[PDB]
C-alpha cells in the first residue's frame, strides 16, 4: 500500500545544514502534494510547507522561509527537505505527510529526529542518588541515579538487573548546552535498603558505555 519512508536520525552542529528524505511508494507520485511538519519535543505540530511534484512549486510557512528548502527527485520518488544554518531551535522531529485535495494529510511518515549540538559522542557521568543522613523516616526509601553530560540519546537505566521494575520511574532526558541529562528513581522498603544492595545499571550504546553504580548510604 501507500507508504512514506523517512531517513534516519540526524546529529549536526550549529550553523551546519541537514537534508532529510521521504521516499514515497505505492501511488502516482505527482498526483499528491507532499507536506512537511515540525514537532518540537512535547509540543504542537507546525506546518513548514509543501511541494507539488508535478509542476515543482513549493509553498512555505513564512516562519521557515530561509530555513527550509523543499525539493523532489522523480528518479527515486523521494521528497527532500533541507534545513540550513542550524540552531538549537531546529532540534525537533520532522514529518512528511501526503496531502489530499490540498485539505487533509492522509499518509504520514514515521518522522525524522534532528538534534543540534556541538557535542560529539560523549559517555555519561553516572551519579548515585542516596538520601542524606536521617532522611529515611518511614517504611519506604527512594533511590536514584543521575545520568549526566552524555550525547546522543538514548540511555537505559536498569535497577538490580531488572528485578525492581514495578517501582521504577524513568525521567525523559533534557538537552542543555549540547549534552543530555536524565534521571531514574526506584523505591524499595526501608527494611531492604541499605541492608541490601541496590545497583543502577546505565547503558549508553553510542559510546559503548555500561556503568554499574552501587547505591551507598
Amino acid at each position: 500500500e501507500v507508504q512514506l519512508q523517512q531517513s534516519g536520525p540526524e546529529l549536526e552542529k550549529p550553523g551546519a545544514s541537514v537534508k532529510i528524505s521521504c521516499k514515497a511508494s505505492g501511488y502516482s507520485f505527482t498526483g499528491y502534494n507532499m507536506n512537511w511538519v515540525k514537532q518540537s519535543a512535547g509540543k504542537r505540530l507546525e506546518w513548514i510547507g509543501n511541494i507539488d511534484p508535478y509542476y515543482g512549486g513549493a509553498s512555505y510557512n513564512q516562519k521557515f522561509k530561509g530555513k527550509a528548502t523543499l525539493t523532489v527527485d522523480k528518479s527515486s520518488t523521494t521528497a527532500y527537505m533541507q534545513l540550513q544554518s542550524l540552531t538549537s531551535e531546529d532540534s525537533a522531529v520532522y514529518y512528511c505527510a501526503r496531502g489530499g485535495y490540498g485539505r487533509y494529510f492522509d499518509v504520514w511518515g514515521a518522522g525524522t529526529a534532528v538534534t543540534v549540538s556541538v557535542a560529539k559522542t560523549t559517555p555519561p557521568s553516572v551519579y548515585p542518588l542516596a538520601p542524606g543522613c536521617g532522611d529515611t523516616t518511614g517504611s519506604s526509601v527512594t533511590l536514584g541515579c543521575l545520568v549526566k553530560g552524555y550525547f546522543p540519546e538514548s540511555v537505559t537505566v536498569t535497577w538490580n538487573s531488572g528485578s525492581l521494575s514495578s517501582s521504577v520511574h524513568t525521567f525523559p532526558a533534557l538537552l542543555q548546552s549540547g549534552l543530555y541529562t536524565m534521571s531514574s528513581s526506584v523505591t524499595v522498603p526501608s527494611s531492604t535498603w541499605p541492608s541490601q544492595t541496590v545497583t543502577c545499571s546505565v547503558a549508553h550504546p553510542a559510546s559503548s558505555t555500561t556503568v554499574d553504580k552501587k547505591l551507598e548510604p
Binding site: 504542537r44 505540530l45 485539505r103 533534557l174
Partner: protein
C-alpha cells in the same frame, strides 16, 4: 493565518464516558481535520472533512462543526483512546491547533517527595546537583520551588515529567538544582517545596548538610 485553539490542552475521562473536545478558529473555515497521536508514533489521520472517519477508526468517534467551531466526540471512551488529538484546517495556509491530550481519569493522589544531596563523585568534578523526585501524583499540575537556606532559588533548575503511567494513571516529576561545588558548599539547608491540589499546604522536603 487562521489560528486554531484547542482547550483544554488536557482532558480527563473514564472508559465508558462520552468525550467531546473542541477546536475553534479565529475566522470561519470550510472543513476541519483531526489527527490522533500517541507517544513515539507519528500523527494519524483520524477524522477528515469535518465528519468522515479514516479507515480503521472506530465508529465511536465522530466529528462535527461549522463556521468557527468544530468538535471531535467519542460516544463511549475506551482506554486505548487516551492520546493527543490535533485539529487542522487549510485556507490560505495549513494550520494546526495546539492539541488536546485525553488522559485517563483517576482519583487525586498526593506526590511522594524525595530529596538527594550531590554525590561525592559529582563534587570531585566541581559540580553539584541537588535532585528532588515527586512521584505518583494526580492530577499532573504541580509546582516545585527550590529554597537554599530558606531563600527561593530560581536559576539552575531543570524539570522533567513522565508520561501518564500505564498501570496506575499517575504522573511523576524530577527536579534538579545544579550549582557549582563552591556555591553548594556555601549553604547548609536545601529544600524542595511542592504545591499540589491534594493539600492546601506546601509539601516541604529538606536536608541540612550539618
Amino acid at each position: 493565518q487562521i489560528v486554531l485553539t484547542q482547550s483544554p490542552a488536557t482532558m480527563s475521562a473514564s472508559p465508558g464516558m462520552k468525550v467531546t473536545m473542541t477546536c475553534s478558529a479565529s475566522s470561519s473555515i470550510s472543513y476541519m481535520h483531526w489527527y490522533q497521536q500517541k507517544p513515539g508514533t507519528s500523527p494519524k489521520r483520524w477524522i477528515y472533512d469535518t465528519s468522515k472517519l479514516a479507515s480503521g477508526v472506530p465508529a465511536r468517534f465522530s466529528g462535527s462543526g461549522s463556521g468557527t467551531s468544530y468538535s471531535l466526540t467519542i460516544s463511549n471512551m475506551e482506554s486505548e483512546d487516551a492520546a493527543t488529538y490535533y485539529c487542522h484546517q487549510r485556507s490560505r495556509y495549513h494550520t494546526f491547533g495546539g492539541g488536546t491530550r485525553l488522559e485517563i481519569k483517576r482519583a487525586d493522589a498526593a506526590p511522594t517527595v524525595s530529596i538527594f544531596p550531590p554525590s561525592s563523585e559529582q563534587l570531585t568534578s566541581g559540580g553539584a546537583s541537588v535532585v528532588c523526585f515527586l512521584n505518583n501524583f494526580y492530577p499532573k499540575d504541580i509546582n516545585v520551588k527550590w529554597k537554599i537556606d530558606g531563600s527561593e532559588r530560581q536559576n539552575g533548575v531543570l524539570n522533567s515529567w513522565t508520561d501518564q503511567d500505564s498501570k496506575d494513571s499517575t504522573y511523576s516529576m524530577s527536579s534538579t538544582l545544579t550549582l557549582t561545588k563552591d556555591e553548594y558548599e556555601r549553604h547548609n539547608s536545601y529544600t524542595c517545596e511542592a504545591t499540589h491540589k491534594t493539600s492546601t499546604s506546601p509539601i516541604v522536603k529538606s536536608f541540612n548538610r550539618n
